[PDB]
Amino acid sequence: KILLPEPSIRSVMQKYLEDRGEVTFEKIFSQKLGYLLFRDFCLNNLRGDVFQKFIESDKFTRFCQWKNVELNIHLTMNDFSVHRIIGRGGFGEVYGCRKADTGKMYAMKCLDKKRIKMKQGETLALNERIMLSLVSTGDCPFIVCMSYAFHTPDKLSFILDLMNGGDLHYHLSQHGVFSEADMRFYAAEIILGLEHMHNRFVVYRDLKPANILLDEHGHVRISDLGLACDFSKKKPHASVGTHGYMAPEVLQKGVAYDSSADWFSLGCMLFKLLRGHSPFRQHKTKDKHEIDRMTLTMAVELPDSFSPELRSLLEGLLQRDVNRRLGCLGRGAQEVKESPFFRSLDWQMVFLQKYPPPLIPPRGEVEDTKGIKLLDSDQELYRNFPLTISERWQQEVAETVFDTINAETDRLEA
Numbered sequence: 001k002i003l004l005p006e007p008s009i010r011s012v013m014q015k016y017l018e019d020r021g022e023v024t025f026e027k028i029f030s031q032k033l034g035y036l037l038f039r040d041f042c043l044n045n046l047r048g049d050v051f052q053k054f055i056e057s058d059k060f061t062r063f064c065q066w067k068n069v070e071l072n073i074h075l076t077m078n079d080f081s082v083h084r085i086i087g088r089g090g091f092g093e094v095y096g097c098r099k100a101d102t103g104k105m106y107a108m109k110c111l112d113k114k115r116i117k118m119k120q121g122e123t124l125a126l127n128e129r130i131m132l133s134l135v136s137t138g139d140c141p142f143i144v145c146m147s148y149a150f151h152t153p154d155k156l157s158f159i160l161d162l163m164n165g166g167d168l169h170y171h172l173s174q175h176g177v178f179s180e181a182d183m184r185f186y187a188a189e190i191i192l193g194l195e196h197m198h199n200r201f202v203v204y205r206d207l208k209p210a211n212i213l214l215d216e217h218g219h220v221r222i223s224d225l226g227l228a229c230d231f232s233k234k235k236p237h238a239s240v241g242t243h244g245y246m247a248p249e250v251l252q253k254g255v256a257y258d259s260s261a262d263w264f265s266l267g268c269m270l271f272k273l274l275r276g277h278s279p280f281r282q283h284k285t286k287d288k289h290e291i292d293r294m295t296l297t298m299a300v301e302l303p304d305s306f307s308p309e310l311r312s313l314l315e316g317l318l319q320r321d322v323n324r325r326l327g328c329l330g331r332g333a334q335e336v337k338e339s340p341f342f343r344s345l346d347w348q349m350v351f352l353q354k355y356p357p358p359l360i361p362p363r364g365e366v367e368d369t370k371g372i373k374l375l376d377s378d379q380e381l382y383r384n385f386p387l388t389i390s391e392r393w394q395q396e397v398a399e400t401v402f403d404t405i406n407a408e409t410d411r412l413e414a
């Protein structure tokens, strides 16, 4: 449980924050806990007069106490109750967990350092940590975002949004293919996920049904940023992604690309939701070269059963040239949102998750490392791995123990 430090911490914490120019209206009011304590004080022009009277008051003393807790966060496994496995991968696995002090539920992505070392995957693990931190502000509800990162002697841990509903690869195998109306629901939420990423200069690259997870109500998020990169710094030129869901720019060896690659992948994926395979698969051939050449040379071949609105969308998303493709011409994601396929969608209500999802998940049922040492050199690579997202910890506290602990602490101090 969270124990606030005694209110004699105030003067030291105020000097700490003043020296970093963080005792202003813009810095404190924008923070969630800063907003609530300022809101609480006002019930007891605002940039000058009101703000400094708040600084003298012990509602700012309380803000300094919570801030002190924030800055001393040093998570270990001991701070989480880890329950059961809800995902697997090459370097490790994902568990459902409860953070002990607040009781908030999260997904813990636990990667094993010995398995990482053995597969020379150090830069990939660091990359997911970097990519997650870029996309994890703004509390976007259509990406599986990070709140904390930390590591132990033998593990890396990402603390991510919990998704108990399973992925769309799995659900395709049970549900079968989706109708246009049902696909539209997933497209609308996935589009907003990609918009949030593209704003922070992140191209996602691995968009496919397996990376679209469902919550217990059936709303979806883009999951796993291991193959994403920051295209602003240098445009990537590597063939990254999944065969059948890669754009022509990505496949063409040498050619640089940006966010454009995702909109092509969206086309591949939405088709897959309707038809059960990538549009460049043809006869379920497992020949990956046949799949890539069909992508590069031959224009996309759509079945006649598709509505004229859906043809416009897919043909637009699957244009082989970036200069013809939806979401690449100037206005970005907004070009896709304006497609005739989404005529009847209010994108505020998509964002607010008001539309009924077409699949509400049912209920689930219930070595290599031997030899590899872990040197000091290996631990040095993860020196800057630990991280806390201020917004996230504050939002967690706000929705769980803020009022209770504030009340408890007032009794200790009165």
Ligand SMILES: Cn1c(CNc2cccc(C(=O)NCc3ccccc3C(F)(F)F)c2)nnc1-c1ccncc1
Pocket (backbone or CB within 6 Å): 086, 087, 088, 089, 090, 091, 092, 093, 094, 107, 109, 111, 121, 124, 125, 126, 127, 128, 129, 144, 160, 161, 162, 163, 164, 213, 223, 224, 225, 226, 227
């Ligand atoms: C389903 N799920 C995945 C799927 N991916 C996954 C799961 C477990 C381990 C790994 C993994 O070992 N990834 C290694 C890897 C593989 C390719 C590229 C980069 C990286 C990494 F960054 F992890 F090094 C991946 N990741 N997070 C979830 C998940 C998130 C929230 N709730 C439920 C599940």
